[PDB]
Amino acid sequence: RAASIRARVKAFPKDDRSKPVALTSFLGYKAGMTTIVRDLDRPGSKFHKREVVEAVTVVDTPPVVVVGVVGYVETPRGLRSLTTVWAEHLSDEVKRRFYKNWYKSKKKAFTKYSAKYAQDGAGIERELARIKKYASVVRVLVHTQIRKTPLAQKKAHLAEIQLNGGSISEKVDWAREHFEKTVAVDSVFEQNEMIDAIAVTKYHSRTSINHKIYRVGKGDDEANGATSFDRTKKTITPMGGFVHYGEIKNDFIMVKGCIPGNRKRIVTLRKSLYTNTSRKALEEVSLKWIDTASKFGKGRFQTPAEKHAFMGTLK
Amino acid sequence: VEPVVVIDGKGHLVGRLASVVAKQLLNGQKIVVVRAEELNISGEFFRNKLKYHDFLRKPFHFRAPSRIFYKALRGMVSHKTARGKAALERLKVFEGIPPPYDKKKRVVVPQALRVLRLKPGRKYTTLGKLSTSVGWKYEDVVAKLEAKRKVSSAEYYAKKRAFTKKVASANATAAESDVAKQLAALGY
RNA sequence: AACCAUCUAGUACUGGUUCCUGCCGAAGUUUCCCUCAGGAUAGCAG
RNA sequence: AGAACUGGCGAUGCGGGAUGAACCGAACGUAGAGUUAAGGUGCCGGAAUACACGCUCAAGAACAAAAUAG
RNA sequence: CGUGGAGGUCAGUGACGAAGCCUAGACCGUAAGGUCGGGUCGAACGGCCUCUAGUGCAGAUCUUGGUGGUAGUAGCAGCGAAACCACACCAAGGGGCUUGGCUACCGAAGCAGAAGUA
RNA sequence: GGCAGCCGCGAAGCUACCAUCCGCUGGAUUAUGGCUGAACCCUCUAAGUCAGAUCCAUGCUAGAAGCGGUGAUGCUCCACACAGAUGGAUACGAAUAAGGCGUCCUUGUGGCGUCGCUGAACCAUAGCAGGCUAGCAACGGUGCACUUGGCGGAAAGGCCUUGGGUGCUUGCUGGCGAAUUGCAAUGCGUGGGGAUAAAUCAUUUGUAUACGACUUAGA
């Protein structure tokens, strides 16, 4: 059985001294599956340029904000958490994660620590300098903005993301500046990038690697579910919403295959832990058409705009 | 004689060191072992990697050199008994010299050194290499932070040498006096 | 095809054989009644 | 296979031999001091990680046997 | 050594407490056992020389009587057994004491090409 | 068109190779291919040494009914109570067919002298289980509480240290008392109350379900 509803990242990719400080993983909530068709541009294949049809999963990825940073000392008995530091503020759902009886409890969340941050910062700057001189491996503390995702969970899942940049002084400087900021989904992953998926099945946790992101969903603009070919004013959400899921109104990610876990389950993504040299990873996934028919039942129409076309008109 | 004894494992035989430590701490003497990764075993790499998998293919097995030394010490003590269990509570084994033992003197056992026991021109194995070959993953960090231990400890020794230089000068200038000659007459 | 009360506490190898202490203390065999059955003899120990 | 001549045990503790009925010492009232046997003296275990000469890098602590000094 | 009973003796012990029982109390003896310290108990019992025997228990798939695990289980919120009961996970030595632990790559080969380690 | 009935179509579901997505990369080694090079010219082997699959690492699953960091308050009254310090664990590193220490220039794998052959060493060690107290010599040594600066992340939590305060100083010169203990018997929290930070149950939730457990939310 899994330890909790959320899964734990057991490894991180090798650090890069030259690259800038950036996040290594992202997490979201499963949003079912959808059908897609694309041109198979793979060279040396008997189906070159053919319209290959396959299923792609959809995961809701609300914005994730940084809430703290943690450094770890390379001790002879493994990595030890040198010091954890939160940034001046904890969200309502962030505080809720620390209570089993939040409604009954007095909601006495960070009070002296918040008051401590109101001081001249010397203590916080002292800890930052400590981390700068001391342990040179740093992990960021973040949470999911479940307040935006339309789920009854209403509880933010805390998670740690390791920075892959060099000059850990730059790491702490970035943390010092990007504290309590919101990180968009597109800032961690991009289209055609190969990622791995980890989640909990319908109850064991398992990891699957070599999964390509078919599309990165910017949920702020319309027609996010329409490709360059279809380019219709349609969202990935079909008519009536989703099966056992509320709605998509924020950033989302589309991944080849089916991530483990039923709908509404939280999942995490990572950049394959290494630089895959396969030509499949390198090739770009041009998109032709994305299915938006009502999954609930058997939808004979894509959107209500064209639904009346078959019937012409209705009472 | 010493409330706590710190033994430098480097350059010592595993068997002889384990036997002497077992005999010493069975008598209530507290002993601490450091730099176990530098402990040596007689014979070349082969026949040392062997005789370990032989018993391994049988339980729980520990790869750390300190755990290997403890297992060697464990079999030389009547474990499962109160005296054996109590005796094993007076022993500490660590890789390198973690504090606060780094700021205290470390002793050696002449009757267990590889140099004084192994004939010249014979191959010998080191605990660190065997541990790494059998799955130890902390050799790199151990070496890295042991090298740092020598760093600034060389400087501390240099400062101590400079201070002893002034001490010797002060003794010499006061030497040859009536009190100095009187002390020297009585062997002091 | 059985059951009830006495002759019958029958017809011999399975099992058991109850308090303490001290001293002495063997044998697994001779060979005669030839032999399976065992008696009497011979040795050890009183 | 068949025996058979003397012997260890039949009923026998104790010390050593990882344990053992065929091994070694030794056979028995209750305790102290002292000296020993086999057996041992790196720890478990009480005792010299004793001394001296050479041998062996691989185990070493009757059966697969026939091919460094003179 | 101990017990049932009997002859003799202690002008014995005893309602101001005899016997029995209990007792993480003590004394005596090599022991069968005796004696005393404290609690319940209530009316008979013992120190010693002899006589007497239905005279001493660890078992006899032993007899009577009593009580446990099995088990609040099988079973018919409640009722409720029976069989069985010396004792309780494995490696080696020794029947369940000793020591401890949960097809690829290479080499030979008139191998032109095609096509021993593990 | 009732209902314990039949038919055409049928979402939702368990589920399929009956369909869909994915399913490893770095090192040491047997044999083997070679270099340098003796026994004994040669030689892959004696000492060294490159390549190379069985093994170890990477990733993955769980986490000792082992460990680190972080947030919240234990605050107050009443009543009771209790495996073996007694000199100092005195700190470079490296080799063991070489090392330290001092000097200087030839700054280098330098020349010289010096030391080991154990720690049998260094500190301190005098005062009633270590008092009272009068002087001398220095401006030192040091106990205790302050204060300044740096330093120790391997289990740092320890190291010094600028400055002043107050005691001792046995460094040196003297006085006051020891008795009779009689000749030795080593000589630290509760269990009841006042407020309150948090957990479990009730309710609900279902992404969990044989019973535990797990997953949500309402002052």
Side-chain angles (χ1 to χ4, degrees):
Chain A
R1 287 180 277 194
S4 173
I5 196 156
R6 179 176 62 78
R8 164 163 156 280
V9 184
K10 282 208 201 287
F12 278 107
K14 287 172 72 178
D15 198 272
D16 197 339
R17 297 281 92 179
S18 76
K19 276 187 184 189
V21 182
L23 293 102
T24 41
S25 49
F26 214 90
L27 76 176
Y29 305 88
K30 190 94 172 288
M33 262 61 58
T34 193
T35 309
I36 193 172
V37 287
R38 81 187 213 80
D39 58 335
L40 194 143
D41 206 27
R42 205 170 292 100
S45 300
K46 295 185 178 71
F47 299 88
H48 190 58
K49 294 280 196 293
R50 271 66 138 192
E51 301 176 347
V52 70
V53 67
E54 61 204 315
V56 296
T57 194
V58 182
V59 46
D60 172 43
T61 48
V64 161
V65 316
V66 173
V67 292
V69 64
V70 191
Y72 291 79
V73 289
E74 277 169 288
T75 84
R77 315 184 311 289
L79 295 165
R80 156 184 166 209
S81 61
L82 182 62
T83 287
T84 62
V85 61
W86 322 83
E88 200 172 11
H89 276 298
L90 273 71
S91 184
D92 189 270
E93 32 65 19
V94 159
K95 301 140 62 172
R96 196 190 273 265
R97 173 58 62 164
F98 298 84
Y99 295 83
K100 296 269 196 168
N101 306 271
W102 162 267
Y103 88 102
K104 191 198 295 301
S105 65
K106 305 296 185 74
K107 295 167 195 70
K108 190 147 279 198
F110 283 50
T111 37
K112 304 170 179 162
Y113 191 85
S114 298
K116 188 194 289 197
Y117 222 107
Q119 86 204 351
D120 62 324
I124 305 302
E125 307 324 314
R126 179 57 263 194
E127 294 296 333
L128 266 46
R130 190 92 63 72
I131 289 163
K132 194 175 287 198
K133 182 186 176 183
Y134 294 104
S136 58
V137 77
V138 190
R139 295 185 198 173
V140 179
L141 269 160
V142 310
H143 92 83
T144 52
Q145 283 192 337
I146 208 161
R147 56 94 164 182
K148 200 167 186 173
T149 285
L151 276 170
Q153 181 67 13
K154 199 158 169 58
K155 208 164 188 163
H157 292 78
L158 273 281
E160 271 200 335
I161 299 165
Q162 177 169 343
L163 300 169
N164 206 255
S167 185
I168 59 108
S169 190
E170 269 66 6
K171 286 188 205 277
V172 61
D173 296 346
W174 185 95
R176 190 189 189 193
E177 295 166 352
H178 284 68
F179 273 159
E180 80 100 19
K181 299 298 184 285
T182 188
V183 184
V185 186
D186 62 345
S187 318
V188 186
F189 295 123
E190 57 172 349
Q191 296 185 14
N192 317 316
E193 195 185 328
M194 273 288 202
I195 59 91
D196 60 87
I198 63 102
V200 187
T201 174
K202 181 65 172 64
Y203 202 64
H204 292 223
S205 90
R206 284 284 176 167
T207 294
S208 305
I209 54 164
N210 301 338
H211 287 273
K212 191 185 275 270
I213 292 158
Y214 261 48
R215 166 159 278 200
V216 174
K218 296 171 79 98
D220 64 297
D221 193 8
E222 191 52 276
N224 288 312
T227 80
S228 180
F229 285 75
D230 171 279
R231 64 174 68 199
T232 61
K233 288 183 168 68
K234 70 180 181 191
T235 315
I236 54 135
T237 308
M239 314 188 284
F242 279 92
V243 179
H244 298 165
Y245 174 75
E247 186 57 28
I248 293 281
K249 289 194 172 186
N250 58 263
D251 293 358
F252 70 94
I253 276 165
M254 199 164 74
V255 182
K256 197 192 193 187
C258 39
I259 296 154
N262 54 260
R263 73 286 309 164
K264 309 183 280 185
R265 195 93 91 202
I266 200 169
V267 313
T268 314
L269 308 89
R270 181 176 55 197
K271 60 187 293 303
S272 313
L273 287 168
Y274 55 82
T275 307
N276 198 329
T277 318
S278 67
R279 300 279 75 72
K280 278 160 180 176
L282 270 288
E283 58 142 310
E284 53 262 90
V285 284
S286 45
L287 310 184
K288 191 170 275 283
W289 186 75
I290 292 153
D291 172 35
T292 181
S294 182
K295 274 85 193 68
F296 171 49
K298 294 287 175 78
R300 296 187 289 193
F301 334 97
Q302 297 300 306
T303 77
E306 306 95 14
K307 166 161 186 159
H308 64 75
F310 171 43
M311 314 307 200
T313 185
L314 293 165
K315 162 58 170 296
Chain B
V1 61
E2 204 172 356
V4 179
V5 178
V6 179
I7 309 178
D8 182 15
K10 180 255 184 190
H12 294 70
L13 290 312
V14 66
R16 301 190 182 285
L17 196 68
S19 174
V20 300
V21 164
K23 187 55 161 175
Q24 285 294 120
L25 101 170
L26 276 163
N27 305 358
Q29 178 55 64
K30 293 193 172 76
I31 282 157
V32 177
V33 191
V34 282
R35 286 168 63 182
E37 74 291 348
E38 302 219 88
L39 194 70
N40 313 136
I41 307 185
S42 74
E44 51 93 10
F45 207 65
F46 257 71
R47 315 220 310 286
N48 271 289
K49 201 153 73 84
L50 269 64
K51 312 255 186 181
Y52 180 85
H53 283 81
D54 301 338
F55 107 96
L56 198 88
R57 59 211 293 161
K58 192 192 286 184
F60 294 73
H61 331 89
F62 299 80
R63 274 83 178 178
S66 55
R67 299 290 86 204
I68 291 160
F69 190 57
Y70 191 89
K71 181 178 81 71
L73 266 161
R74 187 160 165 285
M76 304 214 196
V77 171
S78 278
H79 61 289
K80 314 192 178 177
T81 62
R83 170 159 154 281
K85 288 184 177 182
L88 293 173
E89 203 175 41
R90 316 183 191 116
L91 174 74
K92 289 195 175 76
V93 195
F94 309 111
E95 287 79 11
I97 314 198
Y101 301 118
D102 57 358
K103 254 68 181 296
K104 310 215 82 74
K105 163 63 102 173
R106 55 197 71 82
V107 85
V108 291
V109 180
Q111 78 194 42
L113 263 302
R114 188 207 65 256
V115 46
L116 288 162
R117 293 304 317 180
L118 262 289
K119 201 150 67 74
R122 196 173 301 290
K123 288 298 204 179
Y124 56 94
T125 306
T126 299
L127 271 200
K129 198 80 173 184
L130 177 58
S131 55
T132 285
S133 81
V134 303
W136 195 38
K137 67 184 77 165
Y138 295 112
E139 180 162 49
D140 307 86
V141 180
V142 164
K144 186 180 167 185
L145 97 171
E146 267 289 296
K148 181 180 159 193
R149 206 288 321 292
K150 304 174 191 170
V151 173
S152 316
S153 40
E155 285 81 293
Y156 148 79
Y157 164 73
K159 192 175 190 302
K160 191 184 185 187
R161 188 174 62 207
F163 182 78
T164 53
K165 215 195 215 181
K166 297 167 64 163
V167 173
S169 83
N171 177 83
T173 180
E176 314 313 318
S177 61
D178 296 337
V179 67
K181 292 291 290 190
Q182 197 178 1
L183 272 162
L186 303 175
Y188 270 85

